[PDB]
Short mmCIF file of C-alpha atoms in Angstrom, two decimals:
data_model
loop_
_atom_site.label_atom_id
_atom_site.label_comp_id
_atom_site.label_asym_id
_atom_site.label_seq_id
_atom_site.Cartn_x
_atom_site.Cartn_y
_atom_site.Cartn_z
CA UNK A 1 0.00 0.00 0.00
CA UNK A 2 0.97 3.42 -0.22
CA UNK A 3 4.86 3.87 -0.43
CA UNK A 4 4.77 6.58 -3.48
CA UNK A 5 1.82 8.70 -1.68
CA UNK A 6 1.38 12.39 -3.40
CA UNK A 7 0.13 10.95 -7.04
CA UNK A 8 -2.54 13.57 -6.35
CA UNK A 9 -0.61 16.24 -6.97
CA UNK A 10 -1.43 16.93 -3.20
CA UNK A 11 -1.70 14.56 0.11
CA UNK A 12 1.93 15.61 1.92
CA UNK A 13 2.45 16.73 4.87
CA UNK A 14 3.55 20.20 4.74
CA UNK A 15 6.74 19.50 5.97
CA UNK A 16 8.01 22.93 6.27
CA UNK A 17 4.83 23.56 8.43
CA UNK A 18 6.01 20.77 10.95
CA UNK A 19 9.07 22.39 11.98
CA UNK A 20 7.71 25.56 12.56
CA UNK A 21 5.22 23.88 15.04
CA UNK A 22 8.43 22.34 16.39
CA UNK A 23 10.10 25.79 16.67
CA UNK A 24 6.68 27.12 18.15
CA UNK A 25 6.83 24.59 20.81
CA UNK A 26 10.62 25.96 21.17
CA UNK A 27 8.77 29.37 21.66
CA UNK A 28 6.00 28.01 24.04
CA UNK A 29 8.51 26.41 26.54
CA UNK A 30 8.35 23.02 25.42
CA UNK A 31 11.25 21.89 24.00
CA UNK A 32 11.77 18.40 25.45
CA UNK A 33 12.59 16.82 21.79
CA UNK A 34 14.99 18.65 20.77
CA UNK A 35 18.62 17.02 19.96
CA UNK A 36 21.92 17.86 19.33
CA UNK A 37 22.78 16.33 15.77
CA UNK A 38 22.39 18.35 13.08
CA UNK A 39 21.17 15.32 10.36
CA UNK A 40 22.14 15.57 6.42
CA UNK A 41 19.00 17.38 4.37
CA UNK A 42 18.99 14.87 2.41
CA UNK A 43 18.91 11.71 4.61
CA UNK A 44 16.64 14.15 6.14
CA UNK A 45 13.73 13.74 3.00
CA UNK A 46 14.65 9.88 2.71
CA UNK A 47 13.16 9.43 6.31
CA UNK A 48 10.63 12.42 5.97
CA UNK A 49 9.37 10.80 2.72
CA UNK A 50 8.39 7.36 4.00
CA UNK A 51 5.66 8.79 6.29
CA UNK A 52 3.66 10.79 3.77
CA UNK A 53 5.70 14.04 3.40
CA UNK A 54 7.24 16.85 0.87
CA UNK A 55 11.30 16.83 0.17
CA UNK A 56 12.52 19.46 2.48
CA UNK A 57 15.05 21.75 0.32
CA UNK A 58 17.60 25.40 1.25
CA UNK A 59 14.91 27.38 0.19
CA UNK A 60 12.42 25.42 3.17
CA UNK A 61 15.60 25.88 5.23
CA UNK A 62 15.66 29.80 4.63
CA UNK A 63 11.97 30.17 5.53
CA UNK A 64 12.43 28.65 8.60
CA UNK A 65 15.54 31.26 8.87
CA UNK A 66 13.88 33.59 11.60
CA UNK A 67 12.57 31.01 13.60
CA UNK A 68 16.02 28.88 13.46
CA UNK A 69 17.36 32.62 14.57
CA UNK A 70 15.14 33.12 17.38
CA UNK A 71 15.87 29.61 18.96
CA UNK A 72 19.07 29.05 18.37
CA UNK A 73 18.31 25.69 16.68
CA UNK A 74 19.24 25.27 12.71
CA UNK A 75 16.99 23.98 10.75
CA UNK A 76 19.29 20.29 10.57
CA UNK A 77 19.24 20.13 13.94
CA UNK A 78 15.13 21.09 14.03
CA UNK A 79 15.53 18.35 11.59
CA UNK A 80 16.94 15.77 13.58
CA UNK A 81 14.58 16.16 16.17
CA UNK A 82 11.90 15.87 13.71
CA UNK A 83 13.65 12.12 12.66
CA UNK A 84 13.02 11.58 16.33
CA UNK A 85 9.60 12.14 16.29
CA UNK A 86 9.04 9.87 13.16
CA UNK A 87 10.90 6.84 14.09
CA UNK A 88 9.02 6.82 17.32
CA UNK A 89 5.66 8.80 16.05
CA UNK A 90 5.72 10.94 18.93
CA UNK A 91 5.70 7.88 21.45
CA UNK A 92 2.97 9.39 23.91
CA UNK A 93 4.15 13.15 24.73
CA UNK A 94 2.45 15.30 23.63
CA UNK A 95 4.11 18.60 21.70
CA UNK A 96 2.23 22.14 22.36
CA UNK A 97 -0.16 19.89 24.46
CA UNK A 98 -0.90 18.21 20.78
CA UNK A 99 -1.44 14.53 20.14
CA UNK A 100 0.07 14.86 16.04
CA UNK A 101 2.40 16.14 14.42
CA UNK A 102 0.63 19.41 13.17
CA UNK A 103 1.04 20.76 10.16
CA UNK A 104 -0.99 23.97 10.07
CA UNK A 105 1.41 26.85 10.75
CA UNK A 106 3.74 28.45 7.88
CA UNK A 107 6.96 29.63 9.65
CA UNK A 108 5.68 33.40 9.22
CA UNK A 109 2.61 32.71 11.33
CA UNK A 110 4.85 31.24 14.19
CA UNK A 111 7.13 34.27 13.72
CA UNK A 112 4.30 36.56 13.79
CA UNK A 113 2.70 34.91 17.00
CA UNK A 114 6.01 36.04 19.10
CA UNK A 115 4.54 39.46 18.78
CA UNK A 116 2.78 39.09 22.42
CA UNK A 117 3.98 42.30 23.83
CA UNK A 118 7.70 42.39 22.20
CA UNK A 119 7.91 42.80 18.80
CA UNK A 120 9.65 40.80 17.34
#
């Protein structure tokens, strides 16, 4: 079943979108999953891939530029902790209180909800 998912022309994950909610966790206070290896981007995608997900790329990288700023973290490292998260599919914590891997924030909307009184 499966294997070669987006045939649609659609149906990924918006990978991109998953390490901003990772970086908004960062943000939050919640920032239990992060790691200290800073994985290849490619090897990145070849894990990303098998779970329903877009190639990650330098351009995704250099959206994620403000937030990777603001943290601390690069994006390989973000990365990294993302493989985590796969291999184990989140094993029972939760992230931002969330059950999933959530997919519904573009890095700019995590950037823009820092503005809570500082700004940036």
């Amino acid at each position: 079943d499966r294997q070669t998912a987006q045939a649609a022309g659609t149906d990924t994950t918006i990978t991109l979108n998953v390490l901003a909610w990772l970086y908004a966790a960062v943000i939050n206070g919640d920032r239990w999953f992060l790691n200290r290896f800073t994985t290849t981007l490619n090897d990145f995608n070849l894990v990303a891939m098998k779970y329903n997900y877009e190639p990650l790329t330098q351009d995704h990288v250099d959206i994620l530029g403000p937030l990777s700023a603001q943290t601390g973290i690069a994006v390989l490292d973000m990365c990294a902790a993302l493989k985590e998260l796969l291999q184990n599919g989140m094993n029972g914590r939760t992230i931002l209180g969330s059950t999933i891997l959530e997919d519904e924030f573009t890095p700019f909307d995590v950037v823009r909800q820092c503005s809570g009184v500082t700004f940036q």
